[PDB]
Design a protein around this ligand. Structure first.
Ligand SMILES: Cc1cc2nc3c(=O)[nH]c(=O)nc-3n(C[C@H](O)[C@H](O)[C@H](O)COP(=O)(O)O)c2cc1C
Ligand SMILES: O=[N+]([O-])c1cc([N+](=O)[O-])c(O)c([N+](=O)[O-])c1
Length: 364
């Protein structure tokens, strides 16, 4: 009964009524062709609209940005039109929704790239992981990633412009905020990490060079919309989908966070550990982050409500994003508030398929 989870929080331009956020969750149920959000997706999001803030599944900024069969995009008219329905449905329920925008870079497969060609990255190094394709029956299948081509220097302004344009499209589509996906070994993170970035131009080497692209993107989208509409997800300590953060991860993380603070953006979303686990954040490191960033800090990664209360109470974070508990509990806020039991998770239906394991987890 004590409790800060159920108190309001100003998040840039909007106000969440509680601190229980829905983490971005790739579910691979979009229509192909066209990578189009669906009415079923609308329903799923509408069921969860009691969240303080919903953060959408990763959404491609361009066709080249596509990594997964069934992931949606936000570049085409049909995508914009479908997303508008989805956000209206969330708003119909007095919810708020951020779109997570990404470019997958090297976590992709030639068969879903334009012209069937190699995906792009900082450097020509395979991700050494799998993405998800669809088979002949439309079912999700995990397949090894295709080796990428290194971006040419003269292609980089295009990538920045695709982010900027996607953010314009997000504003039109009715999202409340945008979250740039600079985590989890996707394109922005592929530049940030020395493991994935062997460039010798101004986009690789030093931490200032490795953070250049993400900071260009931040600046571009701040300019396009408003800094109080922009959040960012980072995963800068540990290893995430085979991408570590190099041999100076803490100092490099703090450099990036100082840079982001200067832009006055709505929020910093920290993905603390990979689904396969990692070492917990020290409170010392939490305090170093806190003093470097003056907006909202969202924590994520196998959180319990207790851990969330403990850390908000300590003044170290403002909110928590829950992932898998959100898949299985559309009314998670109510269940956490009432200390109800949660629905059991069905991980076999996290990716692909239809309504089963998607919209069929009941509320109280
Ligand atoms: C099915 C699944 C899909 C995910 N998709 C994304 C994604 O789209 N973007 C992202 O940044 N993280 C993604 N994640 C990570 C979640 O946002 C979250 O950080 C993770 O599940 C850890 O929190 P949890 O223990 O509360 O589930 C995904 C996780 C799972 C289980
Ligand atoms: O498996 N997945 O399909 C998946 C997808 C995304 N994403 O943004 O496209 C992630 O960030 C994560 N993630 O790292 O947790 C997983």
């Amino acid at each position: 009964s004590a409790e800060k989870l159920f108190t309001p929080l100003k998040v840039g331009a909007v106000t969440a009524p509680n601190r229980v956020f829905m983490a971005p969750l790739t579910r691979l149920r979009s229509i192909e062709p066209g990578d189009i959000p669906t009415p079923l997706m609308g329903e799923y999001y509408r069921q969860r609209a009691s969240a303080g803030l919903i953060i959408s599944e990763a959404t491609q900024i361009s066709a080249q940005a596509k990594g997964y069969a069934g992931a949606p995009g936000l570049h085409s008219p049909e995508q914009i039109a479908a997303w508008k329905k989805i956000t209206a449905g969330v708003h119909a329920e007095d919810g708020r929704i951020a779109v997570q925008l990404y470019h997958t870079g090297r976590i992709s497969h030639s068969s879903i790239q334009p012209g069937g060609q190699a995906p792009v990255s900082a450097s020509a190094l395979n991700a050494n992981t799998r993405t998800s394709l669809r088979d002949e029956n439309g079912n999700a299948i995990r397949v090894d990633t295709t080796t990428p081509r290194a971006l040419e220097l003269d292609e980089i302004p295009g990538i920045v412009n695709d982010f900027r344009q996607a953010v314009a499209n997000a504003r039109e589509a009715g999202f409340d905020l945008v979250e740039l996906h600079s985590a989890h070994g996707y394109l922005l993170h592929q530049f940030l990490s020395p493991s994935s970035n062997q460039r010798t131009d101004q986009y690789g080497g030093s931490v200032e060079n490795r953070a250049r692209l993400v900071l260009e993107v931040v600046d571009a989208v701040c300019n396009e919309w408003s800094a109080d509409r922009i959040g960012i997800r980072v995963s800068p300590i540990g290893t995430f989908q085979n991408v570590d953060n190099g041999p100076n991860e803490e100092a490099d993380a703090l450099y990036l966070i100082e840079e982001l603070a200067k832009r006055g953006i709505a929020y910093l979303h920290m993905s603390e550990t990979d689904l396969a686990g990692g070492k917990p954040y020290s409170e010392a490191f939490r305090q170093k982050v806190r003093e470097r960033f003056h907006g909202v800090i969202i924590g994520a990664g196998a959180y319990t409500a207790e851990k969330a209360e403990d850390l908000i109470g300590k003044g170290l974070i403002d909110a928590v994003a829950f992932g898998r508990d959100y898949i299985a509990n559309p009314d998670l806020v109510a269940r956490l508030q009432k200390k109800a039991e949660l629905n059991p998770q069905r991980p076999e239906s996290f990716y692909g398929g239809g309504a089963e394991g998607y919209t069929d987890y009941p509320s109280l």
